[PDB]
Structure formats: C-alpha cells, structure tokens
C-alpha cells in the first residue's frame, strides 16, 4: 500500500523497550515521516527469527486494523517497512510505557498515589478509565472486538494520555456482532468473560468484562487479578458466581460498575457509552 | 467447551500426592509457564527421593497454554521409549496443575551444543532422536514441533524428545523456519512433515546450535521454499549428511525418507568410522 509503506533507509532502530518469546517492541526514529521535516521518535513492533504463522498473521492483522481506526485514545499507525526485509510496524511513541508499568511505578515513585506527572489521585485513575472507555466506544462502533483489553496493553503517552494498543488479537464482528473460534484462544484466562472461556464467544460485551478487569487493575495500581488463584480454577470460580472482591482503594460506585461488567448474562452488562457516562458522573462528584 | 470438560475431567495411576513433591530452583521459563527442578518422595514405588522436572503454568496463562499442558499429559501416558521424555504423573488436587516428568541434567540440546564433541557424538544424537521418532510414528503420533530446543540431554548424553503440547495423533504456533512446505501452504501435519523438521534439527546439530536460514526473515521463507531454495551445506558437515538433510526437505512428502531410512542411514555412518 503506497499510503502506508515507509522507505526502510529512513527508519533507524534503537534499544529494545520490551520483548516476548516471538516478537518485540524497539524504540526507533523515522526521517521525513508523513510530512514532518527531520527525525521523529517512534516505536517499531516486529517479529523474532522464531516467529510462527499465527504471530505473523496477528502482526499483519494489527496493521490492517490500524489503517482503518483513528481515535485520540487508540495508538497511531505511521506506517510499515514490508518489502525487501522483515515486516516492521511503525507506531507512535508513548513515553511512559504500559499503564500497568506506569501504575506499578507510582507505588514506588514519588509523589505517588495520593487518594505533577508522577502524582496520582483517584480523579486521575477515573480519567484514565474514561479515556480507554471512549476508545472502546469508538472501536465497538467500528464493529471491532479487541479481545485482549488489559493494563499491559494500554500505553501511556505525553500528557498522561491513554492509548489502546496491542491489536493483534482483535477481530472484525460485522457478520453476527460476534467472533467465534473453534480452537482455544490466546487471551489470558483472568481477563476473559465467562462466555468466551466456556463457549468461545467474543463480543463487545466480553470486552466490557475485560474492561471491568482493567478497572480493578487501575484502582489497585496494576494489581494481578484473582491474586494467588491458578487460571484453571477460573472455570469453576466464575460458573458458581464468584467474582473478585472490592479492593481497598475503591468506592462502592466504582465496584458496582465492575460487578456490572462481570454479570454472567452479557445483555445485563453495560455498553461502553454507558460506562463513559458512569465515569463522567464519578468525575464530576 | 472442550477445555472446561478436560479441566473438570482432569480434576490414581498418575495422581502424585502434593505433600511428596518439593519444588526446587527454576530451570527456565517462558512468558506463560516454567520448568522447575524438584524432589519426589515415593515416586512410582521407588525408594527415597527421585529428582524430577515439574512443568507449571504462570498466572497469565491462556486457554491455549492450559490445553497444551493437558494435551501433553494425555500424550505422555500412552508412550514409553528410552528417547522420549518419561511422564511420572501430575498433581491435580492441591493448588495449581503440576506436570511431573523425567529430569535430564544438561537441559536443551540447542543449549548443550552452543556451550561446545566429535562428529561421532553428533551422529549418535541424531540417531537417538530418529529412533524415538520411529517409535512415535509407529504409535500414530505426529510431534509437530521437532527442534533442538524441544530435545533434552539426559545423563550419559541420552537424547530425550520433549515438548509434546502441540502433538496430534491419527491457527499454527510452530515456528516458520522448522515447518514443512505443505504445513506452511496447506496447514497439513503428518509424519513426513516431522521428517522435514528433523532435517532442520539435523542442520542444528552439525552447526552446534545454529539459527536456521540466518538473516532471512520468516515472512520471506514462504516464497524461497516454494521456488526451490534450501539451506546450503554448512561447515563441518559431510556430503553424506547434507544429502540426508536435502531429502528431508523434498517438496513432495512421499519423496522424503521415513524415520527407519533415516536411522538406517545414521547406523550406516557410525559403523563406517
Ligand atoms: C507492554 O509492552 C512492552 C512489552 O514488554 N511487550 C512484550 C510483552 C511484547 C510481546 C509481544 C511483542 N510482539 C511484537 C510483535 F511484532 C509480535 N509480538 N512485543 C512485545 C513493555 C513496554 C514497552 C514500552 N516502554 C516504554 C517506556 C515506552 C513504550 N512506548 C511505546 C510502545 C509502543 C508500541 N508505542 N510506544 N513502550 C513496549 C513493550
Ligand atoms: C527449553 O527448556 C527450558 C526453558 O527455558 N524453557 C522455556 C523457553 C519455557 C517455555 C514454556 C514453558 N511452559 C511450561 C508450562 F507448563 C507451560 N509453558 N516452560 C519453559 C531451558 C532448559 C531447562 C533445563 N535446564 C537444565 C539444566 C536441565 C533441564 N532438565 C529437564 C527439563 C525437563 C522438562 N526435564 N528435565 N532443563 C528447562 C526449561
């Protein structure tokens, strides 16, 4: 595609920001990038030499999705180097890294959580959730289930701006408002809705479940969900009716919103436009 | 679904009591799971403590990971061969799912070779793997993920085939650089695609844990293999051995050798030394 193909000579790759088993994200710089003069700091998502067909299909799918979606709280695609070399995916540089990493740092790093850029209040945590909810509102409007919504997969940009990232597992759902796969999914079990885990059904309403898990991560400052519980235990735990308890540092109003997101029946959960309104009513109060 | 049924089913011959397992140091770990050394008291009617390896999931494990671990348990109950990694059992009643397997002291074959052995030792390793694969092929088991990282090196340098989480009897998460051409283009996995992968494993042995297709990205390999290209003859490799690699990488699966032929070729190399 000529609108997205970037000259490889103009990209210069730097240090590794982080790494999986099959791929990595490196800090980079790009010369003469989409009208800009000079160099621009960017992130490059790419595969390792041990890459599977599924990892390659997912990186290709992330590229496809990112060409079609533009939102202030969705990570911005600049382009790709995809001829005479490996597939390099050029995306916006979010300076604070993951939301999980950012929030876990605020425990350790002063001024820290307080109930400018390192001082956090409950007001700021609600704001972060609201930004992500606004991005998911838009992504649900585009007929697009993210599936892997979690605090490790949100990035934190300049001005503490939330950027939904890691679109490799996201699927189109124009067909039937649902994505169903026969085989087992690669979403971590502790972020999955009950119908996704048991029945393999992924909708906007299972992204609402996952968002509920993200809310819990946000208020506990990057907590590990279902702490100490093996992931195989989630099948029986969720079926019988159990959900994560109210974390210390969380209002009744916020916990009701979490419990709403984790209703067994997906029609009884709130849509992303309602979630945005709840968080607005929390903010103003 | 399939996994909720398996998990529930999974929760006597293979149930090891948790109180007799003492987990030791971590041997290594991926994103979603780890392998730890342990001591097992009264393991399968054996006196005292037996050193074992324990595979457990990490707490961000997916359904895919959990299925693979249960699938490995399912496969390893049906197989017993000196060059396949032995299952002793599982802890399923007391906390997380622990899979208890044979302990091989030197780690992965890839890691063993990268530390480094004569050409006779290298040919002996390829033969052992080929023997275990001849056994697996006879048991109707396609391994799928044959590679030097998925072979373990036990005491006396005995090769153990391992990592049975992706094996199937009779989308894709096997790395592109080890997959057969019909696997790449048609998603077909047979004994003859294990042969292809063994050929890549054979290349890894003679290079002392080399990275296959070095400086070619996996995305470009599809069209290089389709057109006819293969890896050239590596250094410290005979004409006889390279010919055996090239035949494992024939496009048509019928033209590739079976594992009896491979073993027979390797038996004929060692007797001529
Ligand atoms: C959560 O993401 C990180 C990580 O460790 N990811 C692992 C788990 C990971 C797994 C698979 C693959 N794959 C990449 C592929 F192409 C395929 N898989 N890459 C990485 C940790 C945070 C890191 C980062 N740190 C800082 C300080 C800034 C920053 N800015 C960014 C990052 C981006 C994309 N834009 N701007 N990113 C990015 C990588
Ligand atoms: C290739 O295997 C190692 C590794 O780092 N693997 C990573 C990449 C990895 C990924 C996923 C999971 N998962 C485990 C799960 F349950 C799910 N995923 N575990 C580990 C490196 C070698 C290490 C080892 N070192 C030594 C010195 C000895 C040794 N002996 C053994 C090992 C066994 C099984 N029996 N005896 N093993 C075992 C782990």
XYZ file of C-alpha atoms and ligand atoms in Angstrom:
636
model
C 0.000 0.000 0.000
C 1.596 3.372 -1.045
C -0.216 5.402 1.712
C 1.453 3.274 4.471
C 4.776 1.982 3.017
C 7.778 3.790 4.544
C 11.350 3.834 2.991
C 13.474 1.403 5.083
C 16.598 3.661 4.808
C 14.664 6.410 6.681
C 13.962 4.219 9.737
C 16.772 3.744 12.311
C 16.116 1.191 15.090
C 17.421 1.668 18.659
C 17.030 -0.136 22.003
C 14.518 -2.839 22.860
C 11.716 -1.388 25.009
C 10.322 -4.854 25.683
C 10.189 -8.401 24.421
C 8.003 -11.512 24.112
C 9.018 -15.049 23.071
C 8.047 -14.434 19.393
C 8.387 -10.622 18.946
C 9.493 -7.265 20.346
C 8.975 -3.506 20.520
C 12.058 -1.318 19.873
C 12.492 2.429 20.258
C 13.320 3.982 16.906
C 13.455 7.124 14.817
C 11.968 7.948 11.385
C 13.204 10.541 8.889
C 10.723 12.536 6.798
C 7.698 10.730 8.286
C 4.298 11.748 6.749
C 5.076 15.426 6.029
C 7.346 16.167 9.073
C 10.802 17.636 8.488
C 13.751 15.823 10.099
C 13.589 12.926 12.570
C 10.606 11.768 14.705
C 10.818 9.335 17.659
C 8.698 6.210 17.034
C 8.111 2.647 18.279
C 8.676 -0.323 15.938
C 6.761 -3.583 16.505
C 8.438 -6.617 14.856
C 8.944 -10.395 14.900
C 11.871 -12.501 16.080
C 13.506 -15.170 13.867
C 11.477 -17.940 15.671
C 8.077 -16.479 14.544
C 5.072 -18.752 13.969
C 2.402 -18.259 11.204
C -0.100 -17.131 13.876
C 2.312 -14.381 15.124
C 2.826 -13.207 11.514
C -0.951 -13.267 10.808
C -1.509 -11.252 14.030
C 1.089 -8.570 13.106
C -0.473 -8.347 9.602
C -3.923 -8.081 11.216
C -2.711 -5.356 13.646
C -1.503 -3.394 10.580
C -4.863 -3.912 8.731
C -6.912 -2.756 11.759
C -4.648 0.262 12.468
C -5.029 1.552 8.841
C -8.820 1.858 9.406
C -9.068 3.246 13.003
C -8.182 6.783 14.075
C -9.067 7.905 17.613
C -7.194 10.137 20.190
C -7.001 7.206 22.684
C -6.081 4.487 20.096
C -2.368 4.078 19.216
C -1.490 5.877 15.973
C -0.014 3.973 12.998
C 2.516 5.879 10.842
C 3.382 3.011 8.513
C 5.323 -0.133 7.747
C 8.541 -1.355 6.106
C 7.192 -4.513 4.398
C 9.319 -5.098 1.233
C 12.980 -6.237 0.908
C 13.175 -7.144 4.624
C 11.178 -8.135 7.734
C 7.758 -6.563 8.439
C 8.403 -3.535 10.700
C 5.316 -1.799 12.068
C 5.879 1.934 12.817
C 3.610 3.325 15.583
C 3.507 6.358 17.920
C 5.934 6.533 20.794
C 4.101 6.579 24.156
C 6.757 7.873 26.602
C 5.636 6.257 29.927
C 5.177 2.679 28.547
C 2.332 0.422 29.678
C -0.459 1.516 32.026
C 0.430 -1.436 34.270
C 4.091 -0.342 34.322
C 3.169 3.306 34.838
C 0.779 2.445 37.711
C 3.161 -0.061 39.376
C 5.851 2.683 39.223
C 3.517 5.152 41.080
C 3.636 2.836 44.165
C 7.451 3.166 44.246
C 7.962 6.635 42.649
C 7.018 9.844 44.485
C 4.803 11.806 44.890
C 2.894 8.601 44.079
C -0.735 7.694 44.704
C -2.462 10.304 46.958
C -6.159 9.188 47.244
C 2.732 16.677 38.646
C 3.334 13.797 36.150
C 4.072 11.219 38.962
C 1.399 12.450 41.479
C -1.845 10.416 41.035
C -5.302 10.921 42.613
C -8.488 8.820 42.354
C -9.665 11.602 39.966
C -6.780 10.714 37.612
C -7.484 6.946 37.758
C -11.158 7.571 36.765
C -9.894 9.832 33.936
C -7.644 7.017 32.607
C -10.552 4.526 32.649
C -12.774 7.137 30.919
C -10.216 7.674 28.087
C -9.937 3.923 27.418
C -13.752 3.595 27.594
C -14.034 6.386 24.945
C -11.596 4.482 22.695
C -13.530 1.204 23.183
C -16.789 3.100 22.454
C -15.302 4.020 19.041
C -13.810 0.534 18.425
C -17.200 -1.083 19.217
C -18.779 1.398 16.712
C -16.245 0.156 14.066
C -17.508 -3.491 14.580
C -14.233 -4.437 16.198
C -13.770 -6.654 19.293
C -10.336 -6.025 20.836
C -10.403 -9.258 22.964
C -7.066 -8.563 24.753
C -8.064 -5.466 26.775
C -5.751 -5.197 29.802
C -3.444 -2.718 31.574
C -0.325 -4.280 29.969
C -1.960 -3.476 26.519
C -2.802 0.210 27.210
C 0.101 2.656 26.652
C 0.565 5.997 28.485
C 1.596 8.925 26.232
C 2.683 12.584 26.684
C 0.197 14.411 28.958
C -0.743 11.045 30.596
C -2.902 10.184 27.573
C -4.203 6.597 27.357
C -3.512 4.806 24.042
C -5.222 1.427 23.434
C -2.579 -0.802 21.829
C -1.801 -4.471 21.003
C -4.434 -5.080 18.291
C -3.004 -8.475 17.092
C -5.842 -10.473 18.706
C -8.653 -8.055 17.677
C -11.319 -9.298 15.239
C -13.963 -7.893 12.889
C -17.576 -8.659 14.012
C -19.840 -7.184 11.249
C -21.064 -10.790 10.422
C -23.164 -11.575 13.549
C -21.962 -8.983 16.163
C -19.714 -11.857 17.458
C -16.380 -13.585 16.842
C -16.364 -17.365 17.404
C -13.288 -19.581 17.009
C -13.493 -23.397 17.252
C -9.975 -23.662 18.757
C -8.682 -22.317 22.109
C -7.923 -18.590 22.425
C -4.626 -16.872 23.375
C -6.214 -14.246 25.731
C -5.035 -14.763 29.338
C -7.825 -16.617 31.261
C -8.128 -13.986 34.044
C -9.278 -11.285 31.541
C -11.811 -13.436 29.700
C -15.570 -13.282 30.007
C -17.409 -16.415 31.146
C -18.971 -16.979 27.671
C -15.548 -16.508 25.976
C -13.945 -19.105 28.350
C -16.737 -21.743 28.237
C -18.406 -21.021 24.847
C -15.637 -19.332 22.724
C -17.967 -16.287 22.054
C -16.285 -12.863 21.768
C -18.442 -9.714 21.502
C -18.247 -6.045 22.584
C -19.890 -7.295 25.825
C -16.881 -9.628 26.537
C -14.656 -6.531 26.008
C -16.876 -4.947 28.713
C -15.955 -7.869 31.036
C -12.259 -7.353 30.240
C -12.675 -3.598 30.839
C -14.101 -4.483 34.274
C -10.857 -6.410 34.946
C -8.920 -3.340 33.678
C -10.851 -1.133 36.187
C -9.714 -3.436 39.008
C -6.080 -3.224 37.704
C -6.364 0.588 37.593
C -7.673 1.069 41.193
C -5.135 -1.432 42.700
C -2.308 0.409 40.780
C -1.521 -2.504 38.457
C -2.665 -5.386 40.643
C -2.566 -9.000 39.482
C -6.231 -10.146 39.057
C -7.566 -13.111 41.098
C -4.337 -12.990 43.171
C -2.910 -16.413 44.127
C -5.609 -18.354 42.185
C -4.440 -20.724 39.344
C -6.008 -19.935 35.939
C -7.611 -23.409 35.611
C -9.636 -22.567 38.780
C -11.415 -19.655 36.927
C -13.780 -22.106 35.116
C -15.450 -23.249 38.332
C -14.964 -19.929 40.223
C -16.921 -17.883 37.593
C -19.615 -20.530 36.933
C -20.596 -20.815 40.611
C -20.973 -16.980 40.852
C -17.696 -15.795 42.440
C -16.067 -12.520 41.382
C -13.064 -10.507 42.639
C -13.799 -8.746 45.959
C -13.880 -4.981 46.472
C -10.219 -3.831 46.539
C -9.107 -1.421 49.286
C -8.824 1.995 47.492
C -12.181 1.613 45.583
C -15.604 3.250 46.021
C -18.951 1.440 46.203
C -19.929 3.259 42.960
C -16.792 2.065 41.118
C -17.177 -1.529 42.461
C -20.839 -1.628 41.307
C -19.532 -0.707 37.826
C -17.030 -3.636 37.999
C -19.730 -6.080 39.172
C -21.953 -4.768 36.302
C -19.181 -5.524 33.781
C -18.879 -9.079 35.240
C -22.571 -10.114 35.021
C -22.982 -13.709 33.721
C -25.623 -12.629 31.193
C -23.912 -10.347 28.548
C -27.095 -8.280 27.776
C -27.264 -7.251 31.506
C -23.725 -5.707 31.314
C -23.384 -2.001 30.385
C -22.337 -0.875 26.866
C -19.227 1.331 26.517
C -21.297 4.546 26.060
C -22.961 3.921 29.475
C -19.579 3.153 31.068
C -18.262 6.551 29.793
C -21.299 8.281 31.385
C -20.850 6.466 34.763
C -17.179 7.541 34.869
C -18.240 11.132 33.965
C -20.786 11.147 36.856
C -17.995 9.796 39.162
C -15.562 12.510 37.997
C -17.927 15.479 38.479
C -18.777 14.269 42.031
C -16.421 -26.139 25.853
C -13.585 -28.661 25.136
C -11.277 -27.145 27.766
C -13.844 -26.800 30.579
C -14.663 -30.536 30.019
C -10.985 -31.558 30.075
C -10.199 -29.387 33.132
C -13.205 -30.817 35.032
C -12.363 -34.423 33.921
C -8.756 -33.856 34.960
C -9.924 -32.688 38.425
C -4.872 -42.909 40.519
C -2.041 -44.435 38.427
C -0.893 -40.874 37.534
C -2.045 -38.785 40.564
C 1.096 -37.962 42.579
C 0.439 -36.709 46.186
C 1.366 -32.995 46.512
C 2.999 -33.373 50.003
C 5.706 -35.637 48.484
C 6.772 -33.039 45.879
C 9.378 -30.404 46.967
C 9.860 -27.759 44.248
C 13.443 -26.528 43.878
C 15.060 -23.985 41.563
C 13.638 -22.729 38.266
C 15.427 -24.358 35.325
C 13.859 -21.918 32.877
C 10.683 -20.105 31.843
C 8.672 -18.506 29.016
C 6.011 -15.757 29.025
C 3.206 -18.103 30.209
C 4.906 -21.009 32.089
C 8.034 -22.506 33.700
C 10.027 -25.665 34.380
C 11.396 -26.276 37.872
C 13.630 -28.983 39.315
C 12.072 -30.938 42.199
C 12.457 -33.938 44.525
C 9.631 -36.539 44.591
C 9.297 -38.923 47.534
C 7.999 -42.483 46.733
C 7.711 -41.711 43.017
C 6.131 -44.792 41.309
C 7.185 -47.232 44.070
C 10.838 -46.004 44.098
C 12.741 -45.691 47.398
C 13.613 -42.250 48.823
C 13.772 -39.109 46.642
C 13.823 -39.017 42.841
C 14.896 -35.832 41.082
C 12.226 -34.710 38.579
C 11.246 -31.779 36.366
C 7.923 -30.025 37.001
C 6.029 -28.050 34.320
C 3.580 -25.470 35.704
C 1.675 -22.536 34.199
C 2.064 -18.888 35.155
C -0.971 -16.888 36.243
C -1.472 -15.036 32.887
C -1.805 -18.471 31.107
C -4.249 -18.544 28.204
C -6.697 -21.431 27.369
C -4.234 -22.348 24.565
C -1.435 -22.875 27.179
C -3.682 -24.831 29.545
C -4.930 -27.081 26.675
C -1.296 -27.725 25.559
C -0.272 -28.808 29.088
C -3.273 -31.183 29.449
C -2.671 -32.394 25.867
C 0.976 -33.205 26.769
C -0.199 -35.181 29.826
C -2.676 -37.074 27.572
C 0.036 -37.985 25.005
C 2.800 -38.943 27.522
C 0.572 -41.504 29.312
C 0.367 -43.516 26.021
C 4.147 -43.572 25.231
C 7.213 -45.250 26.775
C 10.598 -45.146 24.980
C 14.169 -44.513 26.285
C 14.492 -41.477 23.858
C 11.074 -39.917 24.644
C 10.804 -37.930 27.918
C 9.018 -40.049 30.596
C 5.878 -38.900 32.448
C 5.592 -39.932 36.127
C 2.319 -38.156 36.883
C 0.552 -34.978 37.878
C -0.655 -33.039 40.920
C -4.300 -32.066 40.199
C -5.957 -31.718 43.670
C -3.795 -29.235 45.676
C -3.298 -25.815 44.102
C -2.012 -25.401 40.525
C -1.712 -28.088 37.816
C 1.797 -29.627 38.122
C 3.029 -31.964 35.392
C 5.853 -34.239 36.739
C 8.345 -35.504 34.096
C 11.798 -37.082 33.762
C 14.793 -34.934 34.769
C 17.546 -34.597 32.110
C 20.613 -32.912 33.678
C 22.116 -30.975 30.667
C 18.995 -29.004 29.539
C 18.006 -28.474 25.906
C 20.053 -29.915 23.018
C 20.372 -26.398 21.476
C 21.821 -25.020 24.739
C 24.092 -28.092 25.159
C 25.608 -27.626 21.659
C 26.055 -23.813 21.952
C 28.269 -24.426 25.038
C 30.502 -26.822 22.985
C 32.148 -33.079 20.847
C 33.154 -35.232 17.838
C 31.196 -35.851 14.621
C 30.517 -39.385 16.004
C 28.773 -37.864 19.065
C 26.612 -35.582 16.846
C 25.616 -38.563 14.597
C 24.808 -40.582 17.780
C 22.387 -37.808 18.892
C 20.544 -37.642 15.534
C 20.192 -41.463 15.596
C 18.596 -41.491 19.108
C 16.029 -38.830 18.148
C 15.336 -40.730 14.874
C 14.754 -43.913 16.956
C 12.238 -42.167 19.259
C 10.505 -40.626 16.194
C 10.321 -44.063 14.526
C 8.560 -45.209 17.732
C 6.208 -42.157 17.730
C 5.398 -42.558 14.007
C 4.575 -46.264 14.752
C 2.220 -45.087 17.589
C 0.407 -42.801 15.025
C 1.723 -39.628 16.864
C 2.787 -36.577 14.806
C 5.071 -34.450 17.029
C 4.783 -31.139 15.024
C 7.413 -29.114 16.973
C 10.680 -31.077 16.316
C 13.611 -28.737 17.022
C 16.828 -28.637 19.087
C 15.071 -26.501 21.789
C 12.480 -29.333 22.184
C 15.095 -32.121 22.758
C 16.563 -32.726 26.224
C 20.003 -34.160 27.012
C 19.992 -36.637 29.940
C 22.801 -38.393 31.916
C 25.189 -40.306 29.640
C 24.228 -37.766 26.901
C 20.999 -39.653 26.009
C 18.559 -37.675 23.799
C 15.003 -37.237 25.093
C 12.236 -35.984 22.735
C 10.134 -33.451 24.709
C 7.539 -30.619 24.409
C 4.501 -32.724 23.420
C 1.931 -29.902 23.920
C 1.474 -29.421 20.128
C 1.480 -33.149 19.140
C -1.573 -34.709 17.417
C -2.392 -38.402 16.715
C -4.027 -40.042 13.648
C -4.007 -21.462 13.780
C -0.311 -22.620 13.615
C 2.109 -21.974 16.535
C 5.192 -23.912 15.296
C 7.994 -21.526 14.168
C 8.010 -20.984 10.348
C 11.702 -21.914 9.959
C 11.035 -25.540 11.169
C 7.725 -26.202 9.345
C 7.314 -28.319 6.212
C 6.211 -26.625 2.984
C 2.779 -28.361 2.951
C 2.353 -27.199 6.605
C 3.171 -23.595 5.536
C 0.834 -23.522 2.498
C -1.924 -26.119 3.394
C -1.746 -26.440 7.249
C -1.166 -30.237 6.824
C 0.855 -32.071 9.507
C 1.948 -35.720 9.018
C 4.952 -37.947 9.897
C 6.506 -36.682 6.635
C 6.339 -33.033 7.934
C 8.105 -34.232 11.131
C 10.799 -35.616 8.759
C 11.195 -32.085 7.274
C 11.539 -30.700 10.808
C 14.051 -33.451 11.699
C 16.127 -32.330 8.668
C 16.207 -28.804 10.207
C 17.089 -30.372 13.603
C 19.882 -32.291 11.806
C 21.161 -28.966 10.431
C 21.078 -27.569 14.015
C 23.170 -30.495 15.334
C 26.019 -30.125 12.755
C 26.141 -26.289 13.228
C 26.335 -26.716 17.065
C 23.010 -24.981 17.677
C 22.910 -22.636 14.675
C 19.968 -20.365 13.800
C 18.388 -21.819 10.602
C 18.100 -19.615 7.473
C 20.366 -16.976 9.177
C 19.496 -13.380 8.209
C 16.368 -14.449 6.223
C 13.172 -13.228 7.970
C 10.415 -15.926 8.482
C 7.932 -13.863 6.390
C 10.199 -14.235 3.260
C 10.858 -18.012 3.676
C 7.428 -18.982 2.189
C 8.405 -17.934 -1.358
C 12.084 -19.037 -1.078
C 10.993 -22.623 -0.222
C 8.216 -22.631 -2.881
C 10.609 -21.600 -5.718
C 13.079 -24.405 -4.750
C 15.736 -22.876 -2.424
C 17.030 -24.673 0.687
C 19.807 -24.111 3.213
C 23.271 -24.660 1.687
C 25.766 -27.200 3.048
C 27.074 -25.935 6.443
C 30.716 -26.090 7.593
C 31.928 -29.242 9.434
C 29.238 -31.329 7.598
C 29.868 -34.262 5.237
C 28.447 -34.810 1.724
C 26.577 -37.892 3.118
C 24.924 -35.884 5.942
C 23.933 -32.920 3.704
C 22.328 -35.343 1.182
C 20.222 -36.712 4.091
C 19.145 -33.130 5.036
C 18.203 -32.270 1.422
C 15.998 -35.380 1.176
C 14.118 -34.462 4.380
C 13.381 -31.117 2.597
C 11.932 -32.564 -0.652
C 8.745 -30.674 -1.634
C 6.614 -33.793 -2.215
C 6.138 -35.640 1.196
C 6.312 -39.110 -0.471
C 9.856 -38.393 -1.794
C 11.171 -37.707 1.766
C 12.658 -40.652 3.722
C 10.737 -42.335 6.570
C 12.336 -42.428 10.053
C 13.513 -46.092 9.581
C 15.501 -44.969 6.475
C 16.981 -42.003 8.442
C 18.056 -44.257 11.346
C 19.359 -46.819 8.807
C 21.428 -44.040 7.121
C 22.790 -42.935 10.533
C 23.542 -46.573 11.569
C 25.496 -46.911 8.293
C 27.505 -43.704 9.020
C 28.600 -44.839 12.564
C 29.626 -48.391 11.512
C 31.865 -46.690 8.839
C 34.034 -44.827 11.459
C 3.882 -3.789 27.152
O 4.772 -3.568 26.057
C 6.164 -3.786 26.286
C 6.466 -5.277 26.316
O 7.263 -5.778 27.103
N 5.836 -6.086 25.407
C 6.055 -7.555 25.293
C 5.166 -8.239 26.358
C 5.845 -7.938 23.818
C 5.095 -9.047 23.368
C 4.957 -9.292 22.002
C 5.578 -8.445 21.074
N 5.435 -8.672 19.698
C 5.817 -7.830 18.699
C 5.487 -8.403 17.525
F 5.721 -7.880 16.312
C 4.870 -9.627 17.791
N 4.834 -9.786 19.086
N 6.285 -7.402 21.521
C 6.438 -7.144 22.815
C 6.624 -3.064 27.564
C 6.546 -1.545 27.417
C 7.405 -1.097 26.237
C 7.497 0.419 26.229
N 8.156 1.048 27.214
C 8.256 2.387 27.236
C 8.986 3.101 28.346
C 7.667 3.133 26.216
C 6.972 2.461 25.180
N 6.367 3.163 24.135
C 5.652 2.616 23.041
C 5.340 1.287 22.673
C 4.633 1.316 21.525
C 4.100 0.114 20.799
N 4.478 2.600 21.158
N 5.126 3.382 22.119
N 6.932 1.129 25.254
C 6.755 -1.690 24.983
C 6.881 -3.210 25.063
C 13.806 -25.450 26.882
O 13.578 -25.592 28.294
C 13.991 -24.582 29.228
C 13.277 -23.252 29.051
O 13.800 -22.215 29.412
N 12.029 -23.248 28.520
C 11.220 -22.020 28.341
C 11.564 -21.434 26.960
C 9.771 -22.417 28.667
C 8.640 -22.144 27.868
C 7.376 -22.582 28.280
C 7.238 -23.286 29.488
N 5.981 -23.750 29.926
C 5.741 -24.625 30.948
C 4.405 -24.814 31.024
F 3.752 -25.599 31.904
C 3.804 -24.045 30.030
N 4.735 -23.412 29.373
N 8.327 -23.535 30.216
C 9.539 -23.129 29.858
C 15.540 -24.430 29.256
C 16.233 -25.712 29.740
C 15.746 -26.012 31.161
C 16.553 -27.134 31.759
N 17.811 -26.893 32.123
C 18.561 -27.859 32.676
C 19.991 -27.576 33.063
C 18.006 -29.131 32.871
C 16.661 -29.356 32.484
N 16.076 -30.613 32.664
C 14.751 -31.013 32.343
C 13.654 -30.333 31.758
C 12.614 -31.193 31.677
C 11.245 -30.905 31.121
N 13.019 -32.375 32.166
N 14.343 -32.239 32.575
N 16.000 -28.328 31.945
C 14.236 -26.324 31.082
C 13.482 -25.086 30.586
